[PDB]
Write a protein that binds this ligand. Structure first.
Ligand SMILES: Nc1ncnc2c1ncn2[C@@H]1O[C@H](COP(=O)(O)OP(=O)(O)OP(=O)(O)O)[C@@H](O)[C@H]1O
Ligand SMILES: Nc1ncnc2c1ncn2[C@@H]1O[C@H](COP(=O)(O)OP(=O)(O)O)[C@@H](O)[C@H]1O
Ligand SMILES: [Mg+2]
Lengths: 88, 347
């Protein structure tokens, strides 16, 4: 991601529990680290956003990308499928 | 004049060390030149043994060649399936290589000869006892089993609440042996019809023998391929014919219960509150807590009845402490999560 799309968390409505969950599981362990190692609680390695279509999963992903200094690396499922064997 | 002569020795000795290093550097330069003439050798498998001096090798990503061994090679090693490096021009088998990797084999071959004490899996002293009474006698004294005549003790079952520590039971009983301790949970053994067998039923017993004692651990049999006749044929095949290295299948999920189809069946009780304390203590050990922390009244208000319920309650308690610099959890903090998870689980 080089354009850094802009989407403040205020633009996401109806998901306050889920936004906090994603920030604490994908962001808090990222920029703090040593704190988590202090309490010795293993942060989850990944977050799977599942729900009915249009619930706003991609919107929360965009919000995290916009309000996170981390280097977002987007990609799509179809993108990791290629004809040549082993290309994916 | 002595100092000057010693000074010359310093310059002279520096050159001697440098030339020695230069010779070492050059001797490497000669070595790489010799390796330059070296040519690659294709990699293939010895599919079959036509004769003493003739072999069938299928190149990794090419055609199959009939080739012959170099000469000073132990033809015993070149058995069907062995990897070999054919010469690029004569296509003659030159050397054998070990086989490794493979996508599917990550959990059906790995051995775990660790030592996890039964204290790690708390509140199941009675349940662990049956495992020893079921997996210890057959392993220790096959002679007494053969003396009586009844050879196969296989079967077993751990039906009960989901994921309350079922894997741990097969781990705590792994105190002695249980090295490989493979897991094939609902997958690769029947796959509805026969989908999985030999390469998904024998390859099991395979490492389950070419190694120390292991546990097949066909956990969660209630989700295999998602058929009953195939499963009945599945459990009555040559499986018990060999029973190599006292490997006992330990299926656990929820006239097939008779001997030869399913051995002792044990129902895992819902986590007892008095046992619930045991779980909170072991599970909550690692998290940095404070002295005032009490694992006493949590169970009274924490009857989630699931082992993982206690794990996240311990972990989710930390996330309560993630906000604020609290390096330790307080008794109220645990009660805060217990009133959350013990009520959240209802949704
Ligand atoms: N809770 C929400 N807060 C704010 N906007 C939302 C919310 N839910 C949906 N939207 C809006 O509606 C659309 C929801 O789809 P979105 O782009 O978030 O991807 P998605 O929900 O993952 O959809 P899909 O399932 O098709 O991938 C977006 O335009 C988003 O801005
Ligand atoms: N009684 C228990 N003792 C120790 N750990 C437990 C217990 N109950 C649950 N757990 C935790 O839950 C997990 C075990 O889940 P498991 O029973 O293997 O699920 P499944 O039955 O679906 O395989 C482990 O990570 C373990 O830490
Ligand atoms: Mg999406």
């Amino acid at each position: 991601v080089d354009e850094r799309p802009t989407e403040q968390y205020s633009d996401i409505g109806g998901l306050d529990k889920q936004i906090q969950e994603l920030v604490e599981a994908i962001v808090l362990p990222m920029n703090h680290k040593e704190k988590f190692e202090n309490l010795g609680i293993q942060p989850p390695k990944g977050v799977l956003m599942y729900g009915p279509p249009g619930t706003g999963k991609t919107l929360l992903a965009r919000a995290c990308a916009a309000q996170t200094k981390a280097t977002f690396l987007k990609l799509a499922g179809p993108q990791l499928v290629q004809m040549f064997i082993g290309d994916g | 004049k002595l100092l000057e002569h010693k000074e010359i020795d310093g310059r002279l000795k520096e050159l001697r060390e440098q030339l020695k290093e230069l010779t070492k550097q050059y001797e490497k330069s000669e070595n790489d030149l010799k390796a330059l003439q070296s040519v690659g050798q294709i990699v293939g498998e010895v599919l079959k043994q036509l004769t003493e001096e003739k072999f069938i090798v299928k190149a990794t990503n090419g055609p199959r060649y009939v080739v012959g061994c170099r000469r000073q090679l132990d033809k015993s090693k070149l058995k069907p399936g062995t990897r070999v490096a054919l010469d690029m021009t004569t296509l003659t088998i030159m050397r054998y290589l070990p086989r490794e990797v493979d996508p599917l084999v990550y959990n059906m071959s790995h051995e775990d000869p660790g030592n996890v004490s039964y204290s790690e899996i708390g509140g199941l002293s009675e349940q662990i006892r049956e495992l020893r009474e079921v997996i210890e006698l057959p392993l220790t004294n096959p002679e007494l089993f053969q003396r009586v005549g009844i050879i196969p003790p296989k079967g077993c079952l751990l039906y009960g609440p989901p994921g309350t520590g079922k894997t741990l039971l097969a781990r705590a009983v792994a105190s002695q042996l249980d090295c490989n301790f493979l897991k094939v949970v609902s997958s690769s053994i029947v796959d509805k019809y026969i989908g999985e067998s030999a390469r998904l039923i024998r390859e099991m017993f395979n490492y389950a023998r070419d190694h120390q004692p292991c546990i097949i651990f066909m956990d969660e049999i209630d989700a295999i391929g998602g058929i009953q006749r195939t499963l009945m044929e599945l459990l009555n095949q040559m499986d018990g014919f060999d029973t190599l290295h006292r490997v006992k299948m330990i299926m656990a999920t929820n006239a097939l219960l008779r001997p030869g189809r399913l051995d002792r069946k044990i129902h895992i009780d819902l986590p007892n509150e008095q046992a619930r304390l045991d779980i909170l203590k072991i599970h909550a050990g690692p998290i940095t807590k404070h002295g005032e922390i009490d694992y006493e009244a949590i169970v009274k208000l924490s009857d989630g009845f699931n082992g993982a319920d206690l794990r996240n309650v311990c972990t989710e308690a930390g996330m309560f402490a993630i906000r604020a610099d609290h390096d330790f959890v307080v008794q109220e903090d645990f009660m805060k999560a217990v009133r959350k998870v013990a009520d959240s689980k209802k949704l």
